[PDB]
Amino acid sequence: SIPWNLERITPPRYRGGSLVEVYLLDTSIQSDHREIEGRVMVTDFENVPEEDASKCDSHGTHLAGVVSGRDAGVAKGASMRSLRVLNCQGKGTVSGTLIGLEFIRKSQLVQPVGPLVVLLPLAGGYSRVLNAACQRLARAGVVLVTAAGNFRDDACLYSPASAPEVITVGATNAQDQPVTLGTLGTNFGRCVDLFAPGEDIIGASSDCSTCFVSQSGTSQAAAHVAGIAAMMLSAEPELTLAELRQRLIHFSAKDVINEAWFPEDQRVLTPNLVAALPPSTHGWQLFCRTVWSAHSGPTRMATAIARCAPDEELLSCSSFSRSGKRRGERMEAQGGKLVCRAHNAFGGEGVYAIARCCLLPQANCSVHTAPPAEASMGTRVHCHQQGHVLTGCSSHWEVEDLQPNQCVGHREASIHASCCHAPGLECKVKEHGIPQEQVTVACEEGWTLTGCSALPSHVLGAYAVDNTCVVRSRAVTAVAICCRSR
């Protein structure tokens, strides 16, 4: 009898959302529906383009019910406030959406409450200004959750989906597969943070005050994550966006989507995660996430930059090109904070920089670099200070072509070690090599992959997938640095 979607997000151990407020920017809603009556406040903010009542409020009413519905909601608690930025046909404007986001911010300034979650169950094409407004609102301390888009396309081509500070949510079905929606479906790619239930999702129907309807879409998916965020933030109100995002990733079901559904090049970029509520079972734990940059493009001196959140540490840096035409990557400081920079090769189509960004308080991390040795034992650098741990190795080169706490690179390459004093931290290195398109090595359960690299036959790149280090080539050896709280 429990709707499948609400079971899907229920953790393997369990025992909301009231300190938190969820804003909805959507169609009008039927606020007297019994799922949401007395829990949703209609602001009567409205900014919608002209068309070109049961039907008018169908989308918004359903989503308010997915977020907060008495019977079928995720955060059955929670308080919501609704702004109308979509017309009866489900169409809005970027300007109306901006004015809506601004209204939320002004409301907060005038009457401050606790954590705010803003659900944006809508998409247009890439918009600089909409992305900027979202970023500003995120930087102002509001959590934003948006739909990936229903275009079976790269979410980076859409907004607000493409805004990095917004939690972007794709849709999966009861079989944990990406949702098909007519001839299209859930968007995917590196701007999607995670997936959530978004097919056959039962919720309030604005047909009648006690009626229900199943709807499908990445809006529905996003509503689940808005609900989960509201619950998580009620439990841990002080979470930074980066802490909340790391929890959303950490508590997700992993590696359950068949990535064959996605275009080939998007498989590696698309997180294989289906959202879930945190278990009741939960001291401190090491959380890391893999941040893929925008592709650098083909310019000869092109660089891709993957950055971490202000409160995260960059523990490693890798790179990847589908051609393998690559000058590697380096961890470089920037505004007093380390970023992962990857370098394209001459004639390369471009490369991705792939950061491993981790929540490590009390860590003092640095980078130790050595230039090409040009001889014999390869280029080597180590974390020489007593008690510092190596968390990541990177290597870049400028040429057209070719032991604890030590990184080793090619003799013609520079080598970079991420070294942290993190006294609560234990790390080990696990290696695996074989004769081969992909080699793979996983950290042990309860350990967090901090770094992933290939021993220095032509590798396309390396990247962490959850706690598995993947090395891609055209004996090749994957090397994972795995750490945990001690």
Binding site: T93, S95, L101, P121, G125, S127, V129, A132, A133
Partner: protein, 92 residues
């Protein structure tokens, strides 16, 4: 350094209304004055304009209904970071 942007998905564009985004630390008073300056400079060229909204609180700027003919003029206003043509979003 002021740039113009419009939606790559041509059907989703809404020509004739523009979001004028001013540089980060621009003050509301400066945004309002910039809007007025635009309307005055437009009027002198024979163009009707309407300032639909003045943004402050997240981004400074304004929303203006005007002919795109005025965009080169608008890009030369003080404080302008970029201007974006309005466009459509859709329920997902």
């Amino acid at each position: 350094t002021a740039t113009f942007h419009r939606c790559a998905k041509d059907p989703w564009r809404l020509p004739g209304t523009y979001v004028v985004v001013l540089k980060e630390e621009t003050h509301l008073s400066q945004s309002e004055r910039t809007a007025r300056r635009l309307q005055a400079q437009a009027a002198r060229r024979g163009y009707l304009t309407k300032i639909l909204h003045v943004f402050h609180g997240l981004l400074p700027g304004f929303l203006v209904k005007m002919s795109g003919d005025l965009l080169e003029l608008a890009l030369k206003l003080p404080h302008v970071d970029y201007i974006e043509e309005d466009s459509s979003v859709f329920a997902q």
